[PDB]
Amino acid sequence: LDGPYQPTTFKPPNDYWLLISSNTDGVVYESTNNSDFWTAVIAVEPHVSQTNRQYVLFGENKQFNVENNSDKWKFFEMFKGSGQSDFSNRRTLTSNNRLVGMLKYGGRVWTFHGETPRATTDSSNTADLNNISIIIHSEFYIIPRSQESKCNEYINNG
Numbered sequence: 001l002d003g004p005y006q007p008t009t010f011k012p013p014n015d016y017w018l019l020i021s022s023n024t025d026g027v028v029y030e031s032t033n034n035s036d037f038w039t040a041v042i043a044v045e046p047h048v049s050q051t052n053r054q055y056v057l058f059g060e061n062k063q064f065n066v067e068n069n070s071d072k073w074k075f076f077e078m079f080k081g082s083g084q085s086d087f088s089n090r091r092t093l094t095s096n097n098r099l100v101g102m103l104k105y106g107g108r109v110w111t112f113h114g115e116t117p118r119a120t121t122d123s124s125n126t127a128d129l130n131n132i133s134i135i136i137h138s139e140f141y142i143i144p145r146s147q148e149s150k151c152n153e154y155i156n157n158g
């Protein structure tokens with residue numbers, strides 16, 4: 001498969017999964033169109049009891065109270081729907097394969113959430129899908145929709 005690509009600011013094409021390989025706690029990527037969609041994935045290592053941590057999302061430092069009592073890495077999707085609106089934990093992937101996925105498709109962003117090995121795809125709407133840029137902080141792989149079954153096997157089995 002195609003990569004790794006090195007961390008960078010990326011404008012992702014339609015009909016391609018970004019398989020993103022997180023190597024450490026912190027921001028995994030920051031995704032926005034600056035209109036109706038912000039999404040940042042915070043990674044939290046196993047056995048973190050509720051505590052406050054500082055993260056730098058979209059050029060501003062921000063504190064989140066995070067906990068992971070599981071023996072599995074947790075990837076918290078932090079969504080907001082306008083620039084002047086506050087962040088929410090919309091979805092959680094719990095996985096020791098430490099891969100997230102992102103796909104621009106059919107005027108929606110699809111991602112993996114739930115627990116491996118039965119993590120599943122879910123969509124989020126946007127009215128400006130094409131102007132979604134993304135700062136990715138780890139090595140990533142590009143998979144075509146043509147090979148979408150492979151993206152699935154990797155999220156859930158590594």
Ligand SMILES: CC(=O)N[C@H]1[C@H](O[C@H]2[C@@H](O)[C@@H](CO)O[C@@H](O[C@H]3[C@H](O)[C@@H](O)[C@H](O)O[C@@H]3CO)[C@@H]2O)O[C@H](CO)[C@@H](O[C@@H]2O[C@@H](C)[C@@H](O)[C@@H](O)[C@@H]2O)[C@@H]1O[C@@H]1O[C@H](CO)[C@H](O)[C@H](O)[C@H]1O[C@@H]1O[C@@H](C)[C@@H](O)[C@@H](O)[C@@H]1O
Pocket residue numbers: 090091092093094113114115118119120122
């Ligand atoms: C039923 C389900 O899929 N629950 C998920 C939940 O999904 C919600 C999200 O997709 C949000 C995103 O904004 O949308 C919700 O639907 C809205 C809808 O969009 C509105 O239009 C509508 O009017 O209202 C509905 C509300 O009904 C979806 O319900 O996402 C959470 C967050 O990721 C997920 O919980 C996580 O994953 C589980 C495994 C566990 O680790 C949790 O702690 C995580 O936070 C929900 O999954 C279920 O979680 C349950 C307990 O909270 C059980 O654990 C259950 O086993 C989980 O379900 C399994 O995993 C799911 C990912 C999915 O694959 C299910 O088919 C499967 O049974």
